[PDB]
């Protein structure tokens, strides 16, 4: 459906277009596998906000309302003269953090929804400007946004995320429902570091697969017919 998510960010629209979307920390471009960032939802969710709304460990966090994103924005970016609140379509790269991490969600009141690998420019509907902390209510629409494609999609179900939860190898969660049914090899079940390596490799595979879908959606419009 056409549900939206929201995120305050000092990175301006020009930078986001150049970067191919809203990136997690340490990632300069959306499609650049280059060298691989750590991907771990549990670590992402427990990251502290300094200059950015949570964007570490391979995910980019969003809120479920403009009001929430704005409030969170002002606690973090109040020193910025101008920042942006990006308006983001729901799609199956998004995981509801509370649902995936369950009782172990670290900031459950935040009700965050996090994009694995960041948010492609084509998934950004538009943006608001915020001045010193004061919201400009003018919604600037993103030309590169694809409405029919994204209005047909929802966030990922939590069951697609339980195996990506990223809890510590020996954490209780891996031997409990629901995660026990999704635990990567080495996570609560039978070379050191298997759980961490598998969690990472599962995240990379998810992102590789998801990127293929985005490429298909955008690049199919560069096809110029002949004869």
């Amino acid at each position: 459906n056409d549900d939206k998510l929201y995120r305050a960010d000092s990175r301006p629209p020009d930078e986001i277009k150049q970067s191919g979307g809203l990136m997690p920390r340490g990632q300069s471009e959306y499609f650049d596998r280059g060298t691989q960032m750590n991907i771990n939802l549990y670590d992402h969710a427990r990251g502290t906000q300094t200059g950015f709304v949570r964007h570490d460990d391979g995910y980019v966090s969003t809120s479920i309302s403009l009001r929430s994103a704005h409030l969170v924005g002002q606690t973090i970016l109040s020193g910025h003269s101008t920042y942006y609140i990006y308006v983001i379509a729901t799609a199956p790269n998004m995981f509801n953090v509370n649902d995936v991490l369950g009782a172990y969600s670290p900031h459950p009141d935040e009700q965050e929804v996090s994009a694995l690998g960041g948010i492609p420019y084509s998934q950004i509907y538009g943006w608001y400007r915020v001045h010193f902390g004061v919201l400009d209510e003018q919604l600037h629409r993103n030309r590169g946004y694809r409405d029919r494609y994204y209005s047909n999609l929802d966030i990922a179900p939590a069951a697609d995320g339980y195996g990506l939860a990223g809890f510590p190898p020996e954490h209780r969660a891996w031997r409990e429902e629901p995660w026990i049914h999704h635990a990567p090899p080495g996570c609560g079940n039978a070379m050191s570091n298997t759980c961490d390596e598998k969690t990472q490799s599962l995240g990379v595979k998810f992102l590789d697969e998801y990127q293929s879908k985005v490429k298909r959606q955008i690049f199919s419009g560069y096809q110029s017919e002949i004869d």
Partner: protein, 103 residues
């Protein structure tokens, strides 16, 4: 001149409209001799062809046949919802005469 696919389809004998309102599930393309054609399916199992060019086609249709194959490939790749197909239902599989996309 018709103003929509339904009225266009009704100008021809042995046609029907299929209302799919769904993306194409599969796209198949062949260059094999005498089977230079495309086949599409939908997830409900409905199967449609773009016919091999033949004596049932007038010269003006040759370019349109090529265009239709182009359209089905890009519709498939972009997951565009197909609204309706006009087909000749006296062929097996049904042979595409026209396509509409909306929504």
């Amino acid at each position: 001149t018709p103003q929509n696919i339904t009225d266009l389809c009704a100008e021809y004998h042995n046609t029907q409209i299929h209302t799919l309102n769904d993306k194409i599930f599969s796209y198949t393309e062949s260059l094999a001799g005498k089977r230079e054609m495309a086949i599409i399916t939908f997830k409900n199992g409905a199967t449609f062809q773009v016919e091999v060019p033949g004596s049932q086609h007038i010269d003006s249709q040759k370019k349109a046949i090529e265009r239709m194959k182009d359209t089905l490939r890009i519709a498939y790749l972009t997951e565009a919802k197909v609204e309706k197909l006009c087909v000749w239902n006296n062929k097996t599989p049904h042979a595409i005469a026209a396509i509409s996309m909306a929504n």
